[PDB]
Amino acid sequence: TNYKPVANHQYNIEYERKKKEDGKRARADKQHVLDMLFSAFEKHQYYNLKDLVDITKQPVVYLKEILKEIGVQNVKGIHKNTWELKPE
């Protein structure tokens, strides 16, 4: 009764369904992302790119492109280099 033949694992179809149901992140307009981007900066002075993506819910490439124009990367030897949401 072990390793019974199966077309797709139950854990896999649920994950596939959730991904399909959620759908790919859409590329929103720059102004809305900027407005949401700066609102996030208010809560925390420093943000990680991986965590910042969740707040913005935007494509990584699109977020980096917009963040690159205004945001800058600050190198921290303690952990790693992260992004700075302060334009200066």
Binding site listing for DNA: 77, 79
**Helices 49-56 and 60-70, axial angle in degrees (round to 10):** 110
**Annotated binding-site positions:** 77, 79
Give the E-state strand segments of 1-88 in sequence order: 72-74, 82-84
Q: Select 15 or 51, whichever has its Cβ closest to another protein.
A: 15
Interacting residues toward another protein by CB under 8 A: 1-12, 14-15, 23-27, 34-35, 37-45, 70, 85-88
- Closest distance of CB 35 from another protein, Å: 7
CA 57 to chain centre: 6
Measured between alpha carbons, how far is 9 from 53 in angstroms, rounded to an integer?
30
Closest distance of CB 19 from another protein, Å: 9
CB closer to another protein out of 28 and 49: 28
